[PDB]
Amino acid sequence: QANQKRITTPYMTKYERARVLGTRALQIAMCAPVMVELEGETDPLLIAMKELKARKIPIIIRRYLPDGSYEDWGVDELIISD
Amino acid sequence: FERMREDREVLRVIFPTGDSKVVLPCNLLRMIWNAQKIFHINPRLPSDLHPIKVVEGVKELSKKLVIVNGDDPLSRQAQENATLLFNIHLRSTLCSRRMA
Amino acid sequence: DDEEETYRLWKIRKTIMQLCHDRGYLVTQDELDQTLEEFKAQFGDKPSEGRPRRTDLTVLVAHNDDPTDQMFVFFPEEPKVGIKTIKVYCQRMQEENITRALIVVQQGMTPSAKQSLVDMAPKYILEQFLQQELLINITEHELVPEHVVMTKEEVTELLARYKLRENQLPRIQAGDPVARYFGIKRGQVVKIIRPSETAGRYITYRLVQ
């Protein structure tokens, strides 16, 4: 699929947000590098959540289409609503 | 006004019964009330809102609500039919006269 | 006994005119809304005697896009139509180099005649209708939305837009009353426009099977 013309919604779905926080929390729990500041954050959930609010999560969401194609949308390109 | 008269007949054909109660995403009457309280609007003083800004603003907003993405006539027709009932309730609530 | 027969014949003719007009055939406005009095003056009120006879009610219309693409509508006198009558109409069509025809039976149709309607399909696309189901135009009903037969170009654009195959769209039986009314066969797509209390207007597309 041509990345110049992505027809999916520009907002991040509640499910995409759930899986992003979950996988990123797992990564942080496995001693992965952190992108943002950690003033008083240790619980991987709170760290992944602050990273989402900061928009500094290094994950790409591969939205599969029914036809078989896919669109790779990065966490920085999507608009967080909640 | 003519566009609202056409929409009026479109609603008459959609709702043959006199039941104006409809389910829609955003409540305009509450948003308007909230704006009245957020900006301390005085209903007794004259307004500084130009009615042309009201018309142009509603048209630009109607273009920003995109249920279907595509410039082709098939997508524009689907978009125009999906946001139809909302665009009608919007043009009828955000009317230049009512806002004045 | 007699005034009802002429009333039925008039109502059937009006429905047939509306049907042909909906299929895209050239139909004049006068005959489209013909009062019962106009019909009695043009055809009669004495079907028991034979004036008018069901053979007189035969209609012949031509398509708006193609003048040579004509269509027949026959009204047999026998309640139960047999294969011989179909052979008569088929030969009639061969003589008049016409390909599409309608048989409005009274009581019904024999099995052999229906099979005869299926074997000569590539040569003569002729359909059957019961007068009992033609006394009312189903498209004017409130439950029946506005159907529109799409063209191969419109279907190609539809499938290319949503990026789907024909077997993925919803289906509609070829024997459906609306499918028979618009005279659609397998492979065609019908566009339905219905009112919606959530969006106002909803356009769906059904594939015939």
Q: Do B82 and C161 touch (CB under 8 A)?
A: no
Paired tokens of B62: 């109607």
* B22 token code pair: 């409809």
**C-alpha distances in angstroms, C2 versus A25, C9, C131?**
86, 11, 16
Residue C6 neighbours by CB distance under 10 Å: 19
Q: Where are the domains of chain A?
A: 1-82
How was this structure determined? It was done by cryo-EM
CB contact under 8 A, B84 and C197: no
Q: Is C157 touching B (CB cutoff 8 A)?
A: yes
Strands A70-74 and C25-26, bridge-based pairing? unpaired
Which residues from chain B sit within 8 angstroms of residue C196, using beta carbons? 14, 85
Question: Are C47 and C109 found together in one domain?
Answer: yes
CATH of the domain at C18: 3.40.1340.10
Helix (H) or strand (E) holding C45: none
What are C168's two structure tokens? 């993925």
Phi–psi pair at B17, nearest 5 degrees: -95, 150
Question: Which chain A positions have a beta carbon within 8 Å of C163's beta carbon?
Answer: 65-67, 69
Question: How many structural domains are present in chain C?
Answer: 2
Domain end among C83, C109, C136: C136
CA B60 to CA B53: how far, in whole Å? 10
CB atoms within 10 A of CB C160: 11
Same domain flag for C101 and C12? yes
User: Taking Cα atoms as reference points, which of C125, C135, C207 lies closest to residue C174?
Assistant: C207
Distance from C-alpha of C70 to C-alpha of C59, rounded to nearest angstrom: 10
Residue C19's H or E segment, with its range, is helix C3-23
CB contact under 8 A, B74 and C197: no
- Assigned fold of A1-82: Eukaryotic RPB6 RNA polymerase subunit (3.90.940)
Rounded CA-CA distance B78/B81 in Å is 5
Q: Based on the domain organization, do C24 and C64 belong to the same domain? A: yes
Q: Is the peptide bond before C52 cis (omega within 30 degrees of 0)?
A: yes
Residues C199 and B84: beta-carbon distance below 8 Å? yes
C164–chain A Cβ distance below 8 A for any pair: yes
C197:B23 CB<8 A: yes
Q: Take residue C187 and report the two structure tokens written for it.
A: 């492979």
Tokens for A60?
């790409």
Residues of A with Cβ-Cβ distance to C164 under 8 angstroms? 66-67
Chains near C with 3+ CB pairs less than 8 A apart are A, B
CA distance C167 to chain A (A): 13
Look at residue B92 and give its three-state secondary structure: helix
User: Are the beta carbons of C13 and C34 closer than 8 angstroms?
Assistant: yes
Three-class HEC string of A31-56 = CCCCCCCCCCCCCHHHHHHHHHHHCC
Q: Is B21 exposed, middle or buried (0-12, 13-18, 19+ CB in 10 A)?
A: exposed
DSSP per-residue codes, C144-199: S-EEEEPPHHHHHHHHHHHT--GGGS-EE-TTSHHHHHHT--TT-EEEEEEEETTT
3-state secondary structure of B48: coil
Same domain, C146 and C205: yes
Q: Do C161 and B74 touch (CB under 8 A)?
A: yes
C73 sits in which H/E element: strand C70-74
Same domain, C50 and C128: yes
Q: Which residues pair with C26 in a beta bridge?
A: C62
Q: Is residue C126 within 8 Å of residue C101, measured between CB atoms? A: yes
Task: Judge if C9 and C105 occupy the same domain.
Answer: yes
- CA–CA gap between residue C65 and residue A20 (Å, rounded): 57
């907003």: which residue's tokens? B61
Q: Which residues pair with C202 in a beta bridge?
A: C194
Q: At what angle do helices B84-93 and B2-14 cross, to 10 degrees?
A: 130
Q: Which of C103, C136, C169 is the last residue of a domain?
A: C136
Which residues, 6+ apart, have CB-to-CB distance to A27 below 8 Å? A44
Cβ C27 vs Cβ C15: under 8 Å: no
Chain C hits for A67, CB-CB cut-off 8 Å, are: 163-164
* B contacts of C201 (beta carbons < 8 Å): 14, 81, 84
Cβ contact, residue pair C200, B72, below 8 Å: no
Q: What is the helix, strand, coil percentage profile of chain B, to 5?
A: 60, 0, 40
- Residue A2 touches chain C, beta carbons under 8 Å: no
Residue A5 tokens, joined: 């013309």
Asked if C192 has any chain B CB less than 8 Å from its own CB, the reply is: no
- With 0-12 / 13-18 / 19 or more C-beta atoms within 10 angstroms meaning exposed / middle / buried, residue B23 is exposed
Check CB contact of A37 with chain C, cutoff 8 Å.
no
Instruction: Report the C-alpha gap between C10 and C135 in whole angstroms.
Output: 9
Counted across chains B and C, CB pairs separated by less than 8 A come out at 38
Give the Cβ contact number of residue C103 at 10 Å. Answer: 21
Reported resolution, Å: 3.1
Structure token pair of residue A7 = 């027809």
C56 and C96 share a domain? Answer: yes
* Domain span including residue C34: 1-136
